[PDB]
Amino acid sequence: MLKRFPTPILKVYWPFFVAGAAVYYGMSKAADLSSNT
Amino acid sequence: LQSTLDNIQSARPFDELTVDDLTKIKPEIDAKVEEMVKKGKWDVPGYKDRFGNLNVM
Amino acid sequence: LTTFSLYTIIVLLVITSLYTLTNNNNKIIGSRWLISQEAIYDTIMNMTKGQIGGKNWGLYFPMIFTLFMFIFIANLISMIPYSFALSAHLVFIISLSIVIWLGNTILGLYKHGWVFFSLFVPAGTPLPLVPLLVIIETLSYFARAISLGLRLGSNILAGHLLMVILAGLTFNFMLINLFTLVFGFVPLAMILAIMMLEFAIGIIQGYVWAILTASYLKDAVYLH
Amino acid sequence: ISYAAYLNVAAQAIRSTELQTASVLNRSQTDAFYTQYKNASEPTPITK
Amino acid sequence: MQLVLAAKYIGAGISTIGLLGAGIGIAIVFAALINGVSRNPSIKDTVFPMAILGFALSEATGLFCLMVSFLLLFG
Amino acid sequence: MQLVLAAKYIGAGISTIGLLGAGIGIAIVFAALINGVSRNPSIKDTVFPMAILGFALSEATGLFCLMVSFLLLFG
Amino acid sequence: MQLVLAAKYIGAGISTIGLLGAGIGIAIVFAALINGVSRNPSIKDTVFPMAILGFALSEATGLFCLMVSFLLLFG
Amino acid sequence: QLVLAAKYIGAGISTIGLLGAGIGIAIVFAALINGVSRNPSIKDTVFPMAILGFALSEATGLFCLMVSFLLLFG
Amino acid sequence: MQLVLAAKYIGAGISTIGLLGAGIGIAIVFAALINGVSRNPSIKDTVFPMAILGFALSEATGLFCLMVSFLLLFG
Amino acid sequence: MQLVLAAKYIGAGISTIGLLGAGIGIAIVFAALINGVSRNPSIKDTVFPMAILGFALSEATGLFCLMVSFLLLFG
Amino acid sequence: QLVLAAKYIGAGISTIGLLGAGIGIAIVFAALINGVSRNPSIKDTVFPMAILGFALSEATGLFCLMVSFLLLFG
Amino acid sequence: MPQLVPFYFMNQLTYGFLLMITLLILFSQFFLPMILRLYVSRLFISKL
Amino acid sequence: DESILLLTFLGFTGLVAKYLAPAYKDFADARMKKVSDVLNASRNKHVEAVKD
Amino acid sequence: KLQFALPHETLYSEVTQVNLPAKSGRIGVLANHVPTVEQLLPGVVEVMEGSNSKKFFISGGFATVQPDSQLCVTAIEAPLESFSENIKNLLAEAKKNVSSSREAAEAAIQVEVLENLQSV
C-alpha cells in the first residue's frame, strides 16, 4: 500500500504549484475583502 | 526436475498472494515499477494482450 | 466549521479505504470493489497516453488521476440530501480550474519562451490580419480557463437545488385537496428521475474534466 | 487493385470449418502467368 | 413594489423558453441512432452508450435554464 | 396585486411558447423510425422500444414548460 | 380591471405560438412516410399505425398551447 | 423599484442563450453516432473530438449562464 | 435616472442572446469534421487544422457578444 | 432624456442579437468545405478561394450588426 | 423625445432582419463547394450561379439595413 | 445556506488545496505505482 | 420539503441495489475469473516445460 | 425471381426477404425497392423465400434491383454453413501475415472476411 516509488512532482509540477500559491495569497486578501460585504 | 515440480506445487497462488511475497523473491517487480513511473508510462507491453485496456471508447 | 471543511475530510477517508481495506492481501486477481479502480486506471492511462502521449504521460497521470478523483468523489458526497458543499462550494472549483490553466500557461511560457504566442499564431493567413489571429487565438486559449471550472459548478449546484424545489412542491402537492393526495406519488417519481440523472452527470463531469484538461495541456506542450 | 481483384481476394479468403470443394480450391488458387507484350518484344510470363 | 414582483414572475416566464431547444436536441440524437442502426445493426451495443450520452448532455443546458426559471418563479 | 396577477396570465402564454420545440422533436424521432424501417424492412422489432424512449424524453422537456405554466397560474 | 382584461387578451395571444412547432412536426412525419414508402411501398401497412402515433404525439404539444389560450378565453 | 424589476428582467433574457449550446451538443453527439455507424471504427479518434465538441458548444451557453446570475443579483 | 440604470442591466441581458449562435456554430464544424473523417478515414490530417480554424471564428462570435454584455452590465 | 439614454443601452443589447446569423453562417461554409474535401481528397486548391469569398460576406453580415451596437452605445 | 427614443430602439431591432441573410449567403457558397467537389468540372458554369444566390440572399438583408438607416433618420 | 456562505473563503480554500496536494503526492508515490505492481506481478507470472 | 427528498433518496438506493449492484457484481465476477485463469495457466505452462 | 448465380455453380435466377450487406450498410429488401445498383461487400446473407431461409456467405459481388424488378445478385460464391471455427482461426493467422506480405487492400480484405466469418 504505502511503499513509495519516487516521483518527480516538484519540478514537473513546479509551474502548476506556482499557480496554486499565487491564488492562495490572493484569496487571503480576497477573504478579508469578502468579510466586508 | 522432480524437485522443480515440488517447488511450484508448494507455491501455487490462485486467489491472492501478496505482491510483497513476489517482491521478496523477485525485487525485479519493484525495479520495473519505479522505472516505469519515472518513464511516464504505466502501460507495460503484454498487459493489454491478456488483461486488456478495460475501456469502451 | 464550514460544510466544505468537513466534507474535504470525508473525501480523504474514503480514498484511503479504496486502496487498503478494499484490496484482499494485495490480490493478483483483483477484489470485487477494486475492479472498478482497475478499469479507471487503464482508461485514464490510455487517455493521457492519448492526449499528451509523451514520456510524461505517466508523469502527468497522477495529476490527471487526482483531478479525476476529486471531482468524481465530490459529486457523490454532495448527492446525500443533507450534504451540499464540495462542488456546490463553487469557490474551490472555479479557483482550481483557473489554477490549472495558469499552470499550463506558465509551463508554455517557460518551455517555449515568449514564442509561446506562436501557439496563438494558428497558421498562415492573409497578411493584414496576421496580428489579429494571435489576439483571438489567445482569447480562445483563455476561454479554456473558465469553461472547465464553471461547467462543473453549474451542473452540480443546479441539480441539488432543482430537486429541493420540486421536493418542496410535492410536499404542498400532498397538502392540497384530496384529489392530489391520490397522485401524490406521481411527482415523487419525477424527483427520483432527477436524483439518478444528477448523479450520473457528475461522474461524467469528473471524466470530462480529466479529458479536457489533458487537451489544454496538448495545446500548451505542442505549439500551434 | 481492381474491384474484382479485391472481391477475388475475398473469394480466396473464404476457403481460409473448412468445407471447400475442388472447384472452390481452383477459384482460390491456381498458377498462371501474364505474358506482357509490346508495341514487339514480350516482357516475360511473370505470375498472373 | 408590485413592479418588482411582477418582474420577478415575468423573468421566470422568459427563462422557460430555453427548454424548447433541449427537447429538439434529444430527438436529433435518437433520430441519428435509428438511422445508424438501420445502416449497421451490429453497431448497437457500442452505440447505445453514445445515444444516452448525447441525450443527457444536450438536455442539461435546458435543465440549467429550468433551474433559473425556478429561481425566479419560486424565489 | 392586479399587476402581479396580470403578469401571471401573460406569463402563462410566455411559458406556453416552449411547447413548439417538443412538437418538432417527436416528429424527428418518428421520421427516423420510418426511414430506417424502409431500408431494412425487419429492423422494427428492436427499434420500436428505442423510438418510444426517444419520444418520452423529448416530450418530457416540453412538459417542463407546461408545468411552469401551471406553476405561474395556480402555484 | 384594465390590467386583468388586457392580460387575458395578451396572454391568450402569446399562448397561441406553441402550436406552430407541432405543425412543422406533423409535416416531418409525413415527409418521412413518403420517402419511406417510395423506398419500399409494402412498408405502408405496418408503418401506418406507427405514423398515426407519431402524428398524434407531435400534435399534442400544439393542442396544449391552444388549451391555455382557451382557458383564458372561454374559461 | 424599477431597478429591482430590471435586474430580474435582465436575468431572464440572458438565460435564453443556453439554448444554443444544447442544440450544439446534440449535433456533435449525433455526428459521433453517425460517424461510428459509417466507419464501424472511427470512434477512437472521433470520441475525443466529440467530447471536445460538447465542451466548446457548452462553453458559449455557460457564458450566458454566468451573465444570468450576475444579472439576477446585479 | 432609474430608467437609464434599468436599461444598462436589461441591455446587457438582451446582448447575451448572440452567444447561442456560436454554440450551434462550433457544433456544425465539428459535425462536418466527424462526418468527413468517418467517410474517408484518412482525410483527418488535412481536415483537422482546417476544422480548428472554423471553430476559432465561430467561437469568436460568442466572445464579441459576451464583451458587449459586460460593457452594458458593469457600465 | 432618461428614455433616450436608456434606449441607447437597450438598443445596444438588441444589436448584439444580429451577430448569431453570421456565427452559424461561417460554420455552414466550413461544413461544406470539410464535406467536399473528404469526398475529393483534394478539391481544396480550387475550392479554398471560393470558400473564402462565401465566408467573407456571411461573416460581414454579423460585423454589420456589431458596428451598429457600437454606434448606439458609444455614440 | 419619445419619437427619437423609438428611433434608437428601432435601430437595435433592424439588426435582427440581417441574420437570415447571413445564413443564406453561406448556404449558396456551401452549395458551390458541395457541387464543385462532387462534379469537379462544373465550376466554370456553376460559379456564376453561386455568386447570384450569394448576392441575392445578401440583398434581402441590405433592404433591412437600408430601413435601419431610414429609421435612424426617422 | 449558512454553511455555504461564510466569508471564510480563504479558510475553506486552504483546506481544499491541502486535500489536492496531499492526494497528488499520495497517489503519485504510493497508490498508483502499487496498481502497476499488481499489473507487473501478474505479467511476470504471465511470463513464467 | 427535504423529507420528501429523503424518501426519494431511499427509493434511489433501492433501485441501485436491484439493478446496478447485481450488474456490478457480475461485472466484478467476469473480470475476476479472467485474471485468475491467466495467472494459473501461466503457472501450469512452466510446469509443462519441467515435464518436457 | 432472385438471381444469385456464381461462376462455378449458378444458384438461382424477387423473393420475400433478402438481407444483404452492401456498401449501403445493411439493407433488407421486401417486395419492391427502388432500382439500386450496389456493390455487395463480403457478407453474411440470408435469403428468404417465404419464411424458409437459405443462408449464404458471399464473397461480395453486386446486387442490382433492376427497373424490371429483378434482384440480380452475382457472387463468386454464395452456403453460410459451408464457410463455417477452425476457418476463423486460420483466417486470423492469414490476416496477420497478409498485412506484411495491393497489400493494403489484401490485408483489409483478410480482416473484413475474418470479421464476417466470426459472425458465422
UniProtKB/Swiss-Prot annotation, chain A:
One of its GO terms (cellular component) is proton-transporting ATP synthase complex. GO terms for molecular function: proton transmembrane transporter activity. It is a single-pass membrane protein. Its main location: mitochondrion. Keywords: ATP synthesis, CF(0), Hydrogen ion transport, Ion transport, Membrane, Mitochondrion, Transmembrane, Transmembrane helix, Transport. The chain crosses the membrane at residues 9-25. One of its GO terms (biological process) is protein-containing complex assembly. Mitochondrial membrane ATP synthase (F(1)F(0) ATP synthase or Complex V) produces ATP from ADP in the presence of a proton gradient across the membrane which is generated by electron transport complexes of the respiratory chain. F-type ATPases consist of two structural domains, F(1) - containing the extramembraneous catalytic core and F(0) - containing the membrane proton channel, linked together by a central stalk and a peripheral stalk. During catalysis, ATP synthesis in the catalytic domain of F(1) is coupled via a rotary mechanism of the central stalk subunits to proton translocation. Belongs to the ATPase j subunit family. F-type ATPases have 2 components, CF(1) - the catalytic core - and CF(0) - the membrane proton channel. In yeast, the dimeric form of ATP synthase consists of 17 polypeptides: alpha, beta, gamma, delta, epsilon, 4 (B), 5 (OSCP), 6 (A), 8, 9 (C), d, E (Tim11), f, g, h, i/j and k. This is ATP synthase subunit J, mitochondrial.
From Swiss-Prot, chain D:
InterPro entries: ATP_synth_F1_esu_mt (IPR006721), ATP_synth_F1_esu_sf_mt (IPR036742). It comes from the Eukaryota. GO terms for molecular function: proton-transporting ATP synthase activity, rotational mechanism. It is found in: Mitochondrion; Mitochondrion inner membrane. The keyword Hydrolase does not apply. Present with 4280 molecules/cell in log phase SD medium. This is ATP synthase subunit epsilon, mitochondrial. It comes from Saccharomyces cerevisiae (strain ATCC 204508 / S288c).
UniProtKB/Swiss-Prot annotation, chains E, F, G, I, J:
It holds the Pfam family ATP-synt_C. It is found in: Mitochondrion membrane. The chain crosses the membrane at residues 14-34, 52-72. One of its GO terms (molecular function) is proton transmembrane transporter activity. One of its GO terms (biological process) is proton motive force-driven ATP synthesis. Keywords: CF(0), Formylation, Hydrogen ion transport, Ion transport, Lipid-binding, Membrane, Mitochondrion, Transmembrane, Transmembrane helix, Transport. It is a multi-pass membrane protein. The record marks E59 as: Reversibly protonated during proton transport. The keyword Lipid metabolism does not apply. GO terms for cellular component: cytosol; mitochondrial inner membrane; mitochondrial intermembrane space; mitochondrion; proton-transporting ATP synthase complex; proton-transporting two-sector ATPase complex, proton-transporting domain. The keyword Manganese does not apply. The modification N-formylmethionine is found at M1. Belongs to the ATPase C chain family. PANTHER family: ATP SYNTHASE LIPID-BINDING PROTEIN, MITOCHONDRIAL (PTHR10031), ATPASE PROTEIN 9 (PTHR10031:SF0). Mitochondrial membrane ATP synthase (F(1)F(0) ATP synthase or Complex V) produces ATP from ADP in the presence of a proton gradient across the membrane which is generated by electron transport complexes of the respiratory chain. F-type ATPases consist of two structural domains, F(1) - containing the extramembraneous catalytic core and F(0) - containing the membrane proton channel, linked together by a central stalk and a peripheral stalk. During catalysis, ATP synthesis in the catalytic domain of F(1) is coupled via a rotary mechanism of the central stalk subunits to proton translocation.
From Swiss-Prot, chain N:
The keyword Hydrolase does not apply. Coiled coil: none annotated. One of its GO terms (biological process) is proton motive force-driven ATP synthesis. It comes from the Eukaryota. Disulfide bonds: none annotated. GO terms for molecular function: proton-transporting ATP synthase activity, rotational mechanism. The keyword Membrane applies. It is found in: Mitochondrion; Mitochondrion inner membrane. F-type ATPases have 2 components, CF(1) - the catalytic core - and CF(0) - the membrane proton channel. CF(1) has five subunits: alpha(3), beta(3), gamma(1), delta(1), epsilon(1). CF(0) has three main subunits: a, b and c. Mitochondrial membrane ATP synthase (F(1)F(0) ATP synthase or Complex V) produces ATP from ADP in the presence of a proton gradient across the membrane which is generated by electron transport complexes of the respiratory chain. F-type ATPases consist of two structural domains, F(1) - containing the extramembraneous catalytic core, and F(0) - containing the membrane proton channel, linked together by a central stalk and a peripheral stalk. During catalysis, ATP turnover in the catalytic domain of F(1) is coupled via a rotary mechanism of the central stalk subunits to proton translocation. This is ATP synthase subunit delta, mitochondrial. The gene is ATP16. The chain holds residues 33 to 158 of 160 of the full protein.
